[PDB]
Design a protein around this nucleic acid. Structure first.
Ligand SMILES: [Mg+2]
Lengths: 178, 80, 113, 80
RNA sequence: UGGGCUACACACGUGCUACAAUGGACAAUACAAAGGGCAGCGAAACCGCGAGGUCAAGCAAAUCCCAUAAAGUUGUUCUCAGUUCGGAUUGUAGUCUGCAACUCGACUACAUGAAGCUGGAAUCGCUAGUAAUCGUAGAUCAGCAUGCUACGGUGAAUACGUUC
């Protein structure tokens, strides 16, 4: 619980001092992490989705939930109810472990890493990170992976504003592009 | 968590070989090599070429100096 | 993995190092000599201590993203200053004074009869 | 001159014209037929009217332009 | 004086280099001919990764120098792929000539690493020291050759025959 321990002690102290929170409950926290992989290629080949599912299962350590198309789009050759993606929701200990690994190992492994974007906030204190390849994650092996694929990592924070969210992520040690 | 639907996940020690930084976090990676920890337990060790401690961006270390200006290079090159 | 690149395991390390941007045959031979790692040993048969030794040396050389970024800026500089060379970079025509009545296909792309 | 031992080549008339212009802030255009002359650090801020073979074309030196010939920044051929 | 003759959506002729294992790289080790040279050829030595630089012997020639041929031979390694094939292109840092290499030179180093997997219709040369292949020299010439003109090394296949 290294990341959790920091949050409980060091991060909480920094945030409450910074924003003059009246109560400890006010202090922002990361509610959940959702990893989404969109696989439109799955329409062309079912195997592509299967390979993605395995990769996400390895990365997160939990079985992904296959996502089915809400609607049919002719341009994408998409039919409603077709499996075109996979998602995992990480909560509790699993979330902290994944996040610490991302900052500690996976983000460093990113090729030509120049820090993460500071502008990637929804305006409601929620941050989304896009990874170019899943090779960055330590578990994934280059030989095993037939096709390099990107992923969306959404970090949902209880923080009302981006600035409070930015502080929380900075305290966690998330690199920022500045 | 549902039983039998999730991949085996175990605490593993991630070691930065370059800076000898050790941290314990969960992973589905299995390592034949195992290392002792501060707590009285032994975990499989995953070796990392680079990490937050070693990575240049995180450190802020400048591996290479900035490119010289056109005026600077001209003067330096011909000694003028 | 060296300099952010997963080099081919099967090949000898002299050759495998050249699969990194900024490293060619000449540089690869130098880096192995400095690290005192044999050229013949295959990457699959490389040792962890040896790998670290190689990694120290490769850190010495500007490679991959670092070199790519530098090269692009020099070309961008030429284009911005409106140099003859820079203008030809913009036009996609031979920059180093080669004739264009014939040939120039690598720069011009495929034929457009 | 490409060889380092020889200095960068500049026509004396061009260099002398620039050197006289050093004193006054309000620089005036320098007409030149010297496409061959190197752009020195001293040239920065000056506008040279370099001949293209038919007309003198205004060329204004910037920092990046140092080390390149004056001819490089005035075209001799026209296409489309 | 400067620019152009060096343009570039394209079409054609003649060449150069490849598409690898009858090869690539590396190392060791042989065998030519025909030419050129006075302010020109320049050795050896030292320095540079190298292109070169420095100093300078000999030599107006069966004497000295250009100038160690290369393919070859014997090993080592790679192992059938866009690669340890190929080397276009581009970046950068140099060398040399010259008054000056921007337009627009040649060469080097490092990096970069295109097309190309043997070529549709069609079409060319060659009957033996020939073709093929490998290097060598000269004229022009400050520098600048995949061209031209010469040179030797290795060295084939096939020709029934004259209907077309
Ligand atoms: Mg002509």
């Amino acid at each position: 619980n290294r990341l959790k321990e920091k949050f409980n002690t060091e991060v909480t102290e920094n945030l409450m001092k910074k924003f003059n929170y009246s109560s400890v409950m006010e202090v922002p926290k990361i509610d959940k992490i959702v990893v989404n992989m969109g696989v439109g290629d799955a329409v062309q080949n079912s195997k592509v989705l299967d390979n993605a599912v395995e990769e996400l299962e390895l990365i997160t350590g939990q079985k992904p939930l296959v996502t089915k198309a809400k609607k049919s789009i002719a341009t994408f050759r998409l039919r409603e109810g077709m499996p075109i993606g996979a998602k995992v929701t990480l909560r509790g200990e699993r979330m902290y472990e994944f996040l610490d690994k991302l900052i500690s190992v996976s983000l460093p492994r990113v090729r030509d890493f120049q820090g993460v974007s500071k502008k990637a906030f929804d305006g409601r204190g929620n941050y989304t990170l896009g990874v170019k390849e899943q090779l960055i994650f330590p578990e994934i092996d280059y030989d095993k992976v037939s096709k390099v694929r990107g992923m969306d990592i959404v970090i949902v924070t209880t923080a009302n504003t981006d600035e409070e969210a930015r502080e929380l992520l900075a305290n966690f040690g998330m690199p920022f592009r500045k | 968590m549902k039983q039998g639907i999730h991949p085996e996940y175990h605490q593993v020690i991630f070691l930065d070989t370059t800076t000898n930084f050790k941290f314990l976090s969960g992973s589905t990676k299995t390592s034949s090599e195992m290392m002792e920890w501060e707590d009285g337990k032994e975990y499989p060790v995953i070796r990392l070429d680079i990490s937050s401690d070693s990575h240049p961006f995180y450190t802020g270390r400048q591996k290479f100096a900035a490119a010289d200006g056109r005026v600077e290079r001209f003067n330096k090159k011909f000694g003028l | 993995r060296i300099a952010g690149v997963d080099i081919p395991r099967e090949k000898r390390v002299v050759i495998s190092l050249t699969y990194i941007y900024g490293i060619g045959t000449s540089t690869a031979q130098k880096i192995l000599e400095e690290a005192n790692v044999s050229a013949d040993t295959r990457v699959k048969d490389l040792t962890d201590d040896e790998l670290g030794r190689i990694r120290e040396v490769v850190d010495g050389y500007k490679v991959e993203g670092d070199l790519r970024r530098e090269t692009n800026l020099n070309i961008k500089r030429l284009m911005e200053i409106s140099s003859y060379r820079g203008i030809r970079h913009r036009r996609g025509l031979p920059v180093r004074g080669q004739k264009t009545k014939n040939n120039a296909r690598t720069r011009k792309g495929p034929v457009k009869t | 001159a490409r060889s380092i031992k020889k200095g960068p080549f500049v026509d004396e008339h061009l260099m002398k014209k620039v050197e006289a212009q050093e004193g006054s802030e309000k620089k005036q255009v320098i007409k030149t037929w010297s496409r061959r002359s190197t752009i020195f650090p001293n040239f920065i801020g000056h506008t040279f009217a370099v001949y293209d073979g038919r007309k003198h074309v205004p060329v204004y030196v910037t920092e990046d332009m140092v080390g390149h010939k004056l001819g490089e920044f005035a075209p001799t051929r026209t296409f489309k």
